[PDB]
Amino acid sequence: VAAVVVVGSCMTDLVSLTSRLPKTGETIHGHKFFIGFGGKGANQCVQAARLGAMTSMVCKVGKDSFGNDYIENLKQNDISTEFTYQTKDAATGTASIIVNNEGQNIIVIVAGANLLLNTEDLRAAANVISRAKVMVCQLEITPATSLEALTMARRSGVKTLFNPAPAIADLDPQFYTLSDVFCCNESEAEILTGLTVGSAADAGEAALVLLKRGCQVVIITLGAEGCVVLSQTEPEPKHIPTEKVKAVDTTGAGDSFVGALAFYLAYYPNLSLEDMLNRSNFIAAVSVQAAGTQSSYPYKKDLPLTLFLEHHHH
Amino acid sequence: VAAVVVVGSCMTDLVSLTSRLPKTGETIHGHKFFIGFGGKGANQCVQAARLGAMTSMVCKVGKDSFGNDYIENLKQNDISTEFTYQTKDAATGTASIIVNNEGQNIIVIVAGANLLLNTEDLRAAANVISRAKVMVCQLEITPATSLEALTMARRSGVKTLFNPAPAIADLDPQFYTLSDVFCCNESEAEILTGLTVGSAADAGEAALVLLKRGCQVVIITLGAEGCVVLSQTEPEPKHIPTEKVKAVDTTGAGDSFVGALAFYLAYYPNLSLEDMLNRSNFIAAVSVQAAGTQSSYPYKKDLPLTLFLEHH
Ligand SMILES: Nc1ncnc2c1ncn2[C@@H]1O[C@H](COP(=O)(O)OP(=O)(O)CP(=O)(O)O)[C@@H](O)[C@H]1O
Ligand SMILES: Nc1ncnc2c1ncn2[C@@H]1O[C@H](COP(=O)(O)OP(=O)(O)CP(=O)(O)O)[C@@H](O)[C@H]1O
Ligand code: NA
Ligand code: NA
Ligand code: NA
Ligand code: NA
């Protein structure tokens, strides 16, 4: 049994390294190309699996080489692929990424097969969703499919962790009311609320607007400032800082955070939210110390033992 | 036995279709992704093979899934892959292409394995090159390998067709003196000559500079305006127009043209140059009426009978 079930996206990353970013109408040469594995849903599932979660990815990829290779990436990370569907009717989702020597980029995302994950696929996954401890979803599949997954999870008493990423300004109200944990970043929170979110203070105001739409718990992640949390039972904002580290590459840090939080929700339910967030921050900040999105996510064996204690730790 | 040997590039085209092109630091979403098969060398080879040429593609790809798929693309088009190599040391060459709804694009090319096609790889193809009628090269592999290929062909009395694409201003002079037929587009002629090329007349002036640098025949393609040709024996420029068509997608039209020219030089050696160029304009103009690159290249069975008749 998979205790963390991620209903969401997989994307093949097609990355070209250049010295300068091209403009409209330009052809340029780069010096290296390589392929990597991304998608917010797969990223989150990877982090939770590497911490020791029994995970399953509910997703759709193409009946194509990229899709086959994605399946193998999931397997290599000890993720169940029992609900990794394929389709003849769309290509695997892609992210075509051009990167310069300073790490600035142009990204073109084509959702592809991710949008064909459908009701009938969710119905086939009903038992796996219902038997989980946590169901995680984002907004890189059809929003209605995410909503159906939240609905199914809630009907089974399964904890719902919703990551509205990338954000949409006007979400169906049920996105809020069906979310036990609503987790977003500063820029997302700006889009959802129409407010500036630069600081922890600003995040507390944004988070309260989100809480009042019917979330049980709101978390806004804040980069190097950690995160801010509020809940229905404790609506005063709590700012949970992260220790200073030397960041190499922050890409994917949010997905690291969310995957770690899903792990702790499923495996350490006894812990307070604050303790779960302290630990999640730590893991995410480990990921920012290395290049390469999924390749940067740490494994349990590489992490401090104190992150896995059953009790509250000073 | 191969009558047309192409020594040149294979590139996997990774294409995203969008409504707008992205700026620095922007993530945008497009509506379709697909993989296509490109590279000037392979494109020219595919066109000549579709016309009925027996062809051999001398090239290098990765020992990777793209490379295996490229090899299958060449086989599907009936092209010999005897001297299509694979290497562990680089990935198959790539073009990551973003195209908006008005057809404007951003292209990032990583040549990759194409650059690792070396003189030893080419030497192994000596018997096939010596038995060919036409050798075709471009500027998408390492210069030393293409110069050696043109050298081999000359030693065997094999007609050389050189496409200086993409063009470089400081072109090695041997590319002129080793080319029996030198074919480039307007923007390429500008780069090579420093002259502005915005009409058929301008093209004739640029072509004459190329001729005096040591080419035997110079052809400048001109898009919808067809092409201009001059030669040592007939140095007066001849403008050869193409009938008006409704273009769907002109990508790869130059490679269709060059591939068709290679076919005619190999299989219809008795036709005049002017007749070959009329026929090659017609075939390229077919290619512009279909979307894509290689998928737009027409097959013999789909073309007018007159294009395959032994005489004018
Ligand atoms: N510079 C930094 N130092 C320490 N921790 C960091 C950090 N940047 C991010 N984190 C950690 O990662 C978590 C997620 O951050 P956030 O959601 O802002 O990342 P992100 O995925 O949007 C970065 P990117 O835009 O580059 O992908 C934070 O709550 C924090 O725990
Ligand atoms: N709009 C059009 N109508 C008819 N024939 C066309 C055409 N565009 C190109 N061609 C044919 O293709 C040949 C090669 O054209 P050229 O070398 O200019 O192509 P290209 O691959 O550089 C695309 P473009 O011409 O749009 O820049 C021309 O000589 C002509 O025969
Ligand atoms: Na995120
Ligand atoms: Na990282
Ligand atoms: Na060309
Ligand atoms: Na075309």
From Swiss-Prot, chain A:
Enzyme Commission code(s) on record: 2.7.1.15
Cofactor: record remark: Requires a divalent cation, most likely magnesium in vivo, as an electrophilic catalyst to aid phosphoryl group transfer. It is the chelate of the metal and the nucleotide that is the actual substrate.
Pathway named in the protein's UniProt entry: Carbohydrate metabolism; D-ribose degradation; D-ribose 5-phosphate from beta-D-ribopyranose: step 2/2
Subcellular location(s) of the protein: Cytoplasm; Nucleus
Activity control summary: Activated by a monovalent cation that binds near, but not in, the active site. The most likely occupant of the site in vivo is potassium. Ion binding induces a conformational change that may alter substrate affinity. Competitively inhibited by phosphonoacetic acid, etidronate, 2-carboxethylphosphonic acid, N-(phosphonomethyl)glycine, N-(phosphonomethyl)iminodiacetic acid and clodronate.
Sequence positions that bind substrate: 11-13, 39-43, 140, 255
Amino-acid positions noted as binding ATP in the UniProt annotation, renumbered to this chain: 185, 221-226, 242, 254-255, 281
Binding site for K(+): 249, 251, 287, 290, 292, 296
Reactions performed catalytically: D-ribose + ATP = D-ribose 5-phosphate + ADP + H(+)
Keyword list, A-Z: ATP-binding, Carbohydrate metabolism, Cytoplasm, Kinase, Magnesium, Metal-binding, Nucleotide-binding, Nucleus, Potassium, Transferase
Cofactor field: Mg(2+)
Record GO terms (molecular function): ATP binding; identical protein binding; metal ion binding; ribokinase activity
Gene Ontology biological process terms from the UniProt entry: D-ribose catabolic process; pentose-phosphate shunt
Active-site residue numbers: 255
Main localization category: cytoplasm
GO CC annotations on file: cytosol; nucleus
Subunit structure: Homodimer.
Family the entry assigns: Belongs to the carbohydrate kinase PfkB family. Ribokinase subfamily.
Function (record text): Catalyzes the phosphorylation of ribose at O-5 in a reaction requiring ATP and magnesium. The resulting D-ribose-5-phosphate can then be used either for sythesis of nucleotides, histidine, and tryptophan, or as a component of the pentose phosphate pathway.
Protein's UniProt name: Ribokinase
Organism: Homo sapiens
Swiss-Prot record, chain B:
Keywords: ATP-binding, Carbohydrate metabolism, Cytoplasm, Kinase, Magnesium, Metal-binding, Nucleotide-binding, Nucleus, Potassium, Transferase
Enzyme class at the top of the EC tree: transferase
Catalytic activity reported: D-ribose + ATP = D-ribose 5-phosphate + ADP + H(+)
Name of the protein this chain belongs to: Ribokinase
Binding site for ATP: 185, 221-226, 242, 254-255, 281
GO biological process: D-ribose catabolic process; pentose-phosphate shunt
Active-site annotation: 255
GO CC, one annotated term: nucleus
Annotated cofactor note: Requires a divalent cation, most likely magnesium in vivo, as an electrophilic catalyst to aid phosphoryl group transfer. It is the chelate of the metal and the nucleotide that is the actual substrate.
